[PDB]
Amino acid sequence: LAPSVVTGVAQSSPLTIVTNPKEPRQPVPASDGADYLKTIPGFAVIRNGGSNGDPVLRGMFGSRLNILTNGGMMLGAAPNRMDAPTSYISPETYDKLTVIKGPQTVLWGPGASAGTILFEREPERFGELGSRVNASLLAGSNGRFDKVLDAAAGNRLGYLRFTGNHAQSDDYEDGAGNTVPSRWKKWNGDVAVGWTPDEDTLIELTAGKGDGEARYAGRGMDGSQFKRESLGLRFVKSNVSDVLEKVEAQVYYNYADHIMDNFRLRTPDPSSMMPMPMASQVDRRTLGGRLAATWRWDDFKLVTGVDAMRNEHRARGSKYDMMTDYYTDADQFPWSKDAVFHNYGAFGELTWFAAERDRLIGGLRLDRASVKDYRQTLKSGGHAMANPTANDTRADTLPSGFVRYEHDLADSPTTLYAGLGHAERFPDYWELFSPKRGPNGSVNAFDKIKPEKTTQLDFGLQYNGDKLQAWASGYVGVVQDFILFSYREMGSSTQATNVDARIMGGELGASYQLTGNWKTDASLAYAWGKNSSDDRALPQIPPLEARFGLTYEEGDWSAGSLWRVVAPQNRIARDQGNVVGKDFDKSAGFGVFSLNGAYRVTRNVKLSAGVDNLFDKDYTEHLNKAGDAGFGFSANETVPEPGRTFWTKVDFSF
Ligand SMILES: [Ag+]
Ligand SMILES: [Ag+]
Ligand SMILES: [Ag+]
């Protein structure tokens, strides 16, 4: 044993990473999904404030990542993604985090060109009647405090389960001593009812609520509300037949209700295009379901099924009378619906266990996607505009698939693997509705922006020895009709556009067990992108970074140190980027050092602590948003990362 603090997660199967998100993590995560991804090589995060980052996998942002929770899809509503999908996930309340890199699965939905991320809670198992609880408290610099509870009781026939958290922090300071407008509050509460009549059968109803707020250094407005509401139903029957091994069915309902203003966590900037109190409410309603069957016989295992998904987006805004001074809050007006999306798909995955050391896996899916523009007018400022595609529909049929070959050697515990994958993605809400202009000669983005089609070779290896566990994965790929934002400056209007891209990169890591008490590990992540249409680099691409860890674990306690070293990024595309951010300047390299320890006091209680960024280094990341002028940020000066921070955490388990 010996407890420890997670500083990196290795890749354990080909293309696949699996971690328990309840373990303490050494750059301490701000209780959102993006922060639990940056201990996994290949992930980078766009900082908005102190929480709610936007994840970026192998340089690929946004909906190119398929982020699921218990199989279902949570989508946000902000026109510029202040509430990215991960800003509604609290990883600590889940039991398992899985990443599958590359377009190398078809089981979990459409258009996951960059990868799939699966936060899961696993069903309770009870034999005798009994109960279990595991909780945690964290406390740290800048008023950071986190409560987490996960209790359950039941017997052989069924169970009731509860998971909650509350978490907050004030503004953090950067290395220079400057207070950064960060600071955020988040709470979640979720219940699950489970019924297990016999041991083949399981039915489970889940429901949950969550809310939060966040100040955003890198935005003209702040998130004063992040309301979530969630229901799901799941059926899993095992051993139906001699070949039929599993049948799973699930329905999910996720509702997001975001508010966005410039007066509840800030005062309106008198010197900006926005001196008046302004609020804007937006919501997102996702309904979806999946039905899959797993056949198993001889040397094969086939998984077939279908899925479907609908989601709806509405908005409404406030009003300020300048003639007098009256403010009419946004909830006094009806919701204007503006978009509805539809997807249905059928998919299958075949696996061939070609004896001992040889595995071939192939999969396919066909998707019918479609969208309707419900905007009756457009916004053009307080005065409105005709929307030329009002009530227009458009649709498409998009096939996807992959083959992958896995080979074990006889000599060493080494697996090699190589895989080819193709993935087509329908444009999402932000790609179709958020740009102010479409491609050249279009009426708007909705009318013209084409799907995105990714073809990519993935390859790598695993070495799972005794003293040394190493891994590596590379990727080479082309992207046709990459959806690309370009920015002009009155001031900041975007144009969505399709271009052709080449992409390549990879991750590699190793963790060597020096003695019984000494462990070191290392990792490296590189992404690269070219815009072939305009012959230049792709924008918003994270630079090369390495992580160096060293751990001493005696008995019952451990101490760790971690170095993070990031190269500069000189490959940039000025005024290009996505719906959230844009490149402007080349970034500086930097180094950050941190310390941690853990101590198991009993089989039920364990302690851990750390200091992040010991030397109070004043630094920023290449992908961080530009800090807002109203907070005293000069042009294109991005949001600084936090300076030295201290945290301690206690973990209960009964
Ligand atoms: Ag916003
Ligand atoms: Ag206004
Ligand atoms: Ag505003």
mmCIF file of N, CA and C in Angstrom, residues 50-133:
data_model
loop_
_atom_site.group_PDB
_atom_site.id
_atom_site.type_symbol
_atom_site.label_atom_id
_atom_site.label_comp_id
_atom_site.label_asym_id
_atom_site.label_seq_id
_atom_site.Cartn_x
_atom_site.Cartn_y
_atom_site.Cartn_z
ATOM 1 N N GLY A 50 -11.324 31.090 -12.111
ATOM 2 C CA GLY A 50 -10.696 30.155 -11.208
ATOM 3 C C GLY A 50 -11.243 28.754 -11.342
ATOM 4 N N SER A 51 -12.354 28.618 -12.047
ATOM 5 C CA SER A 51 -12.944 27.315 -12.317
ATOM 6 C C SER A 51 -13.571 27.363 -13.705
ATOM 7 N N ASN A 52 -14.171 26.237 -14.118
ATOM 8 C CA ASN A 52 -14.886 26.143 -15.393
ATOM 9 C C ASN A 52 -13.950 26.378 -16.577
ATOM 10 N N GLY A 53 -12.853 25.635 -16.613
ATOM 11 C CA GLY A 53 -12.012 25.683 -17.780
ATOM 12 C C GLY A 53 -12.642 24.931 -18.918
ATOM 13 N N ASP A 54 -12.154 25.180 -20.138
ATOM 14 C CA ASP A 54 -12.633 24.434 -21.297
ATOM 15 C C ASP A 54 -11.598 23.400 -21.737
ATOM 16 N N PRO A 55 -11.871 22.099 -21.624
ATOM 17 C CA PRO A 55 -10.843 21.095 -21.925
ATOM 18 C C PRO A 55 -10.426 21.088 -23.386
ATOM 19 N N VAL A 56 -9.174 20.701 -23.610
ATOM 20 C CA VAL A 56 -8.585 20.651 -24.937
ATOM 21 C C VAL A 56 -7.757 19.378 -25.000
ATOM 22 N N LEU A 57 -8.140 18.451 -25.881
ATOM 23 C CA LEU A 57 -7.481 17.159 -26.014
ATOM 24 C C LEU A 57 -6.701 17.151 -27.312
ATOM 25 N N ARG A 58 -5.392 16.839 -27.218
ATOM 26 C CA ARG A 58 -4.470 16.787 -28.353
ATOM 27 C C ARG A 58 -4.681 17.989 -29.250
ATOM 28 N N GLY A 59 -4.831 19.159 -28.656
ATOM 29 C CA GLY A 59 -5.062 20.353 -29.428
ATOM 30 C C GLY A 59 -6.477 20.550 -29.930
ATOM 31 N N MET A 60 -7.388 19.600 -29.706
ATOM 32 C CA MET A 60 -8.741 19.679 -30.253
ATOM 33 C C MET A 60 -9.727 20.079 -29.166
ATOM 34 N N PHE A 61 -10.492 21.127 -29.438
ATOM 35 C CA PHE A 61 -11.346 21.793 -28.463
ATOM 36 C C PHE A 61 -12.813 21.420 -28.669
ATOM 37 N N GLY A 62 -13.627 21.675 -27.641
ATOM 38 C CA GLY A 62 -15.079 21.666 -27.796
ATOM 39 C C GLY A 62 -15.656 20.301 -28.129
ATOM 40 N N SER A 63 -16.668 20.304 -28.994
ATOM 41 C CA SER A 63 -17.468 19.106 -29.218
ATOM 42 C C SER A 63 -16.692 17.988 -29.899
ATOM 43 N N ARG A 64 -15.451 18.226 -30.325
ATOM 44 C CA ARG A 64 -14.618 17.122 -30.791
ATOM 45 C C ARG A 64 -14.298 16.141 -29.678
ATOM 46 N N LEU A 65 -14.562 16.513 -28.433
ATOM 47 C CA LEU A 65 -14.495 15.626 -27.287
ATOM 48 C C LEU A 65 -15.915 15.225 -26.950
ATOM 49 N N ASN A 66 -16.111 13.961 -26.680
ATOM 50 C CA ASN A 66 -17.398 13.430 -26.270
ATOM 51 C C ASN A 66 -17.354 13.221 -24.758
ATOM 52 N N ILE A 67 -17.950 14.136 -23.998
ATOM 53 C CA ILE A 67 -17.927 14.061 -22.542
ATOM 54 C C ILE A 67 -19.287 13.570 -22.056
ATOM 55 N N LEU A 68 -19.305 12.403 -21.412
ATOM 56 C CA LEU A 68 -20.527 11.774 -20.931
ATOM 57 C C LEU A 68 -20.526 11.684 -19.407
ATOM 58 N N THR A 69 -21.726 11.585 -18.839
ATOM 59 C CA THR A 69 -21.909 11.352 -17.412
ATOM 60 C C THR A 69 -22.942 10.247 -17.267
ATOM 61 N N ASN A 70 -22.516 9.095 -16.755
ATOM 62 C CA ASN A 70 -23.386 7.928 -16.629
ATOM 63 C C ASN A 70 -23.997 7.544 -17.964
ATOM 64 N N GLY A 71 -23.273 7.788 -19.043
ATOM 65 C CA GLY A 71 -23.741 7.470 -20.358
ATOM 66 C C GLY A 71 -24.468 8.590 -21.064
ATOM 67 N N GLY A 72 -24.909 9.605 -20.334
ATOM 68 C CA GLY A 72 -25.696 10.675 -20.902
ATOM 69 C C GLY A 72 -24.885 11.940 -21.125
ATOM 70 N N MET A 73 -25.488 12.849 -21.868
ATOM 71 C CA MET A 73 -24.807 14.002 -22.424
ATOM 72 C C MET A 73 -25.373 15.257 -21.777
ATOM 73 N N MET A 74 -24.510 16.022 -21.125
ATOM 74 C CA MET A 74 -24.859 17.309 -20.532
ATOM 75 C C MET A 74 -24.308 18.403 -21.430
ATOM 76 N N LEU A 75 -25.179 19.240 -21.977
ATOM 77 C CA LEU A 75 -24.739 20.336 -22.829
ATOM 78 C C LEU A 75 -25.078 21.665 -22.175
ATOM 79 N N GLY A 76 -24.193 22.656 -22.336
ATOM 80 C CA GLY A 76 -24.408 23.973 -21.772
ATOM 81 C C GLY A 76 -25.152 24.887 -22.729
ATOM 82 N N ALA A 77 -25.347 26.135 -22.300
ATOM 83 C CA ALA A 77 -26.163 27.050 -23.075
ATOM 84 C C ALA A 77 -25.516 28.387 -23.402
ATOM 85 N N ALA A 78 -24.351 28.701 -22.872
ATOM 86 C CA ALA A 78 -23.819 30.032 -23.124
ATOM 87 C C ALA A 78 -23.424 30.156 -24.594
ATOM 88 N N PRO A 79 -23.696 31.299 -25.230
ATOM 89 C CA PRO A 79 -23.323 31.469 -26.646
ATOM 90 C C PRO A 79 -21.839 31.399 -26.898
ATOM 91 N N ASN A 80 -21.007 31.504 -25.864
ATOM 92 C CA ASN A 80 -19.556 31.471 -26.008
ATOM 93 C C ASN A 80 -18.957 30.555 -24.954
ATOM 94 N N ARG A 81 -19.757 29.589 -24.521
ATOM 95 C CA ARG A 81 -19.331 28.473 -23.692
ATOM 96 C C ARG A 81 -18.821 28.862 -22.291
ATOM 97 N N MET A 82 -19.234 29.999 -21.671
ATOM 98 C CA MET A 82 -18.900 30.140 -20.240
ATOM 99 C C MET A 82 -19.270 28.904 -19.440
ATOM 100 N N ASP A 83 -20.350 28.217 -19.801
ATOM 101 C CA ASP A 83 -20.678 27.012 -19.056
ATOM 102 C C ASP A 83 -20.389 25.780 -19.886
ATOM 103 N N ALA A 84 -19.142 25.576 -20.274
ATOM 104 C CA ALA A 84 -18.779 24.350 -20.983
ATOM 105 C C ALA A 84 -19.357 23.112 -20.300
ATOM 106 N N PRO A 85 -19.658 22.035 -21.054
ATOM 107 C CA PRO A 85 -20.090 20.770 -20.435
ATOM 108 C C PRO A 85 -19.427 20.423 -19.108
ATOM 109 N N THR A 86 -18.109 20.602 -18.982
ATOM 110 C CA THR A 86 -17.438 20.134 -17.773
ATOM 111 C C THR A 86 -17.698 21.045 -16.589
ATOM 112 N N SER A 87 -18.218 22.257 -16.812
ATOM 113 C CA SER A 87 -18.503 23.132 -15.682
ATOM 114 C C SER A 87 -19.700 22.653 -14.865
ATOM 115 N N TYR A 88 -20.429 21.654 -15.341
ATOM 116 C CA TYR A 88 -21.498 21.048 -14.575
ATOM 117 C C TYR A 88 -21.090 19.718 -13.948
ATOM 118 N N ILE A 89 -19.950 19.152 -14.303
ATOM 119 C CA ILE A 89 -19.521 17.909 -13.665
ATOM 120 C C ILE A 89 -18.686 18.209 -12.424
ATOM 121 N N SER A 90 -18.976 17.505 -11.321
ATOM 122 C CA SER A 90 -18.058 17.455 -10.183
ATOM 123 C C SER A 90 -17.466 16.060 -10.119
ATOM 124 N N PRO A 91 -16.250 15.867 -10.618
ATOM 125 C CA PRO A 91 -15.644 14.535 -10.633
ATOM 126 C C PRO A 91 -15.615 13.811 -9.310
ATOM 127 N N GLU A 92 -15.494 14.505 -8.179
ATOM 128 C CA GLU A 92 -15.316 13.786 -6.924
ATOM 129 C C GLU A 92 -16.533 12.925 -6.577
ATOM 130 N N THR A 93 -17.717 13.288 -7.074
ATOM 131 C CA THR A 93 -18.926 12.510 -6.834
ATOM 132 C C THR A 93 -19.089 11.332 -7.791
ATOM 133 N N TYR A 94 -18.155 11.116 -8.715
ATOM 134 C CA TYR A 94 -18.185 9.951 -9.586
ATOM 135 C C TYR A 94 -17.202 8.911 -9.077
ATOM 136 N N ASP A 95 -17.283 7.707 -9.641
ATOM 137 C CA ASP A 95 -16.466 6.598 -9.161
ATOM 138 C C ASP A 95 -15.352 6.184 -10.105
ATOM 139 N N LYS A 96 -15.430 6.574 -11.378
ATOM 140 C CA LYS A 96 -14.535 6.104 -12.424
ATOM 141 C C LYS A 96 -14.491 7.157 -13.520
ATOM 142 N N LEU A 97 -13.286 7.514 -13.959
ATOM 143 C CA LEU A 97 -13.110 8.417 -15.089
ATOM 144 C C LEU A 97 -12.342 7.668 -16.168
ATOM 145 N N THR A 98 -12.914 7.583 -17.366
ATOM 146 C CA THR A 98 -12.304 6.874 -18.488
ATOM 147 C C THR A 98 -12.095 7.856 -19.625
ATOM 148 N N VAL A 99 -10.913 7.820 -20.231
ATOM 149 C CA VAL A 99 -10.631 8.549 -21.462
ATOM 150 C C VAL A 99 -10.243 7.529 -22.524
ATOM 151 N N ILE A 100 -10.823 7.651 -23.711
ATOM 152 C CA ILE A 100 -10.403 6.874 -24.871
ATOM 153 C C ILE A 100 -9.952 7.865 -25.924
ATOM 154 N N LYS A 101 -8.659 7.840 -26.235
ATOM 155 C CA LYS A 101 -8.077 8.837 -27.113
ATOM 156 C C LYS A 101 -8.354 8.415 -28.540
ATOM 157 N N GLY A 102 -8.607 9.392 -29.404
ATOM 158 C CA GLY A 102 -8.725 9.133 -30.818
ATOM 159 C C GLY A 102 -10.106 8.664 -31.211
ATOM 160 N N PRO A 103 -10.398 8.672 -32.526
ATOM 161 C CA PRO A 103 -11.700 8.202 -33.020
ATOM 162 C C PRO A 103 -11.703 6.685 -33.094
ATOM 163 N N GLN A 104 -11.639 6.057 -31.926
ATOM 164 C CA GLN A 104 -11.375 4.627 -31.816
ATOM 165 C C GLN A 104 -12.439 3.918 -30.996
ATOM 166 N N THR A 105 -13.619 4.518 -30.885
ATOM 167 C CA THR A 105 -14.781 3.814 -30.379
ATOM 168 C C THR A 105 -16.011 4.345 -31.100
ATOM 169 N N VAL A 106 -17.029 3.494 -31.219
ATOM 170 C CA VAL A 106 -18.308 3.894 -31.799
ATOM 171 C C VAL A 106 -19.467 3.691 -30.841
ATOM 172 N N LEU A 107 -19.211 3.191 -29.629
ATOM 173 C CA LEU A 107 -20.256 2.821 -28.682
ATOM 174 C C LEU A 107 -20.916 4.011 -28.003
ATOM 175 N N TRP A 108 -20.295 5.184 -28.019
ATOM 176 C CA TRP A 108 -20.697 6.223 -27.083
ATOM 177 C C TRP A 108 -21.214 7.475 -27.768
ATOM 178 N N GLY A 109 -21.429 7.453 -29.071
ATOM 179 C CA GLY A 109 -22.059 8.585 -29.702
ATOM 180 C C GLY A 109 -21.304 9.102 -30.906
ATOM 181 N N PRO A 110 -21.824 10.161 -31.522
ATOM 182 C CA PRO A 110 -21.298 10.617 -32.807
ATOM 183 C C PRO A 110 -20.157 11.611 -32.684
ATOM 184 N N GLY A 111 -19.307 11.603 -33.713
ATOM 185 C CA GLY A 111 -18.359 12.678 -33.935
ATOM 186 C C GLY A 111 -17.311 12.873 -32.867
ATOM 187 N N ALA A 112 -16.993 11.844 -32.090
ATOM 188 C CA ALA A 112 -15.907 11.968 -31.124
ATOM 189 C C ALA A 112 -14.576 11.780 -31.853
ATOM 190 N N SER A 113 -14.212 12.805 -32.636
ATOM 191 C CA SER A 113 -12.960 12.755 -33.387
ATOM 192 C C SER A 113 -11.733 12.796 -32.481
ATOM 193 N N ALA A 114 -11.698 13.698 -31.488
ATOM 194 C CA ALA A 114 -10.526 13.780 -30.613
ATOM 195 C C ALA A 114 -10.518 12.668 -29.568
ATOM 196 N N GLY A 115 -11.636 12.451 -28.875
ATOM 197 C CA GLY A 115 -11.679 11.377 -27.894
ATOM 198 C C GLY A 115 -12.985 11.371 -27.127
ATOM 199 N N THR A 116 -13.128 10.351 -26.283
ATOM 200 C CA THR A 116 -14.304 10.162 -25.448
ATOM 201 C C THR A 116 -13.882 10.197 -23.980
ATOM 202 N N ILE A 117 -14.665 10.904 -23.162
ATOM 203 C CA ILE A 117 -14.477 11.005 -21.721
ATOM 204 C C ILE A 117 -15.762 10.543 -21.031
ATOM 205 N N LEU A 118 -15.634 9.573 -20.114
ATOM 206 C CA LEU A 118 -16.778 8.888 -19.499
ATOM 207 C C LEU A 118 -16.677 8.922 -17.975
ATOM 208 N N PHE A 119 -17.364 9.880 -17.353
ATOM 209 C CA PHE A 119 -17.582 9.862 -15.911
ATOM 210 C C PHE A 119 -18.716 8.896 -15.575
ATOM 211 N N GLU A 120 -18.441 7.900 -14.732
ATOM 212 C CA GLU A 120 -19.388 6.838 -14.413
ATOM 213 C C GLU A 120 -19.552 6.695 -12.904
ATOM 214 N N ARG A 121 -20.728 6.237 -12.493
ATOM 215 C CA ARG A 121 -20.961 5.817 -11.121
ATOM 216 C C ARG A 121 -21.347 4.358 -11.175
ATOM 217 N N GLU A 122 -20.756 3.625 -10.440
ATOM 218 C CA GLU A 122 -21.066 2.228 -10.643
ATOM 219 C C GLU A 122 -22.136 1.754 -9.669
ATOM 220 N N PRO A 123 -22.977 0.803 -10.081
ATOM 221 C CA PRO A 123 -24.097 0.398 -9.230
ATOM 222 C C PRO A 123 -23.598 -0.261 -7.959
ATOM 223 N N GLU A 124 -24.370 -0.077 -6.893
ATOM 224 C CA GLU A 124 -24.028 -0.647 -5.605
ATOM 225 C C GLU A 124 -24.153 -2.163 -5.634
ATOM 226 N N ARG A 125 -23.393 -2.819 -4.766
ATOM 227 C CA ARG A 125 -23.499 -4.261 -4.610
ATOM 228 C C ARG A 125 -23.715 -4.536 -3.137
ATOM 229 N N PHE A 126 -24.833 -5.173 -2.820
ATOM 230 C CA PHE A 126 -25.144 -5.500 -1.445
ATOM 231 C C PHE A 126 -25.542 -6.967 -1.392
ATOM 232 N N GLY A 127 -25.041 -7.674 -0.382
ATOM 233 C CA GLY A 127 -25.427 -9.048 -0.131
ATOM 234 C C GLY A 127 -26.251 -9.091 1.134
ATOM 235 N N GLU A 128 -25.582 -9.016 2.277
ATOM 236 C CA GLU A 128 -26.272 -8.691 3.515
ATOM 237 C C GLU A 128 -26.851 -7.277 3.411
ATOM 238 N N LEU A 129 -27.832 -6.982 4.261
ATOM 239 C CA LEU A 129 -28.297 -5.608 4.399
ATOM 240 C C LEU A 129 -27.238 -4.780 5.129
ATOM 241 N N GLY A 130 -26.896 -3.624 4.572
ATOM 242 C CA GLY A 130 -25.885 -2.791 5.189
ATOM 243 C C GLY A 130 -25.793 -1.427 4.538
ATOM 244 N N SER A 131 -24.693 -0.733 4.832
ATOM 245 C CA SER A 131 -24.545 0.648 4.403
ATOM 246 C C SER A 131 -23.075 0.980 4.218
ATOM 247 N N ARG A 132 -22.826 2.050 3.477
ATOM 248 C CA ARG A 132 -21.469 2.527 3.280
ATOM 249 C C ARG A 132 -21.521 4.029 3.055
ATOM 250 N N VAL A 133 -20.487 4.711 3.537
ATOM 251 C CA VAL A 133 -20.340 6.147 3.354
ATOM 252 C C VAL A 133 -18.867 6.421 3.135
#
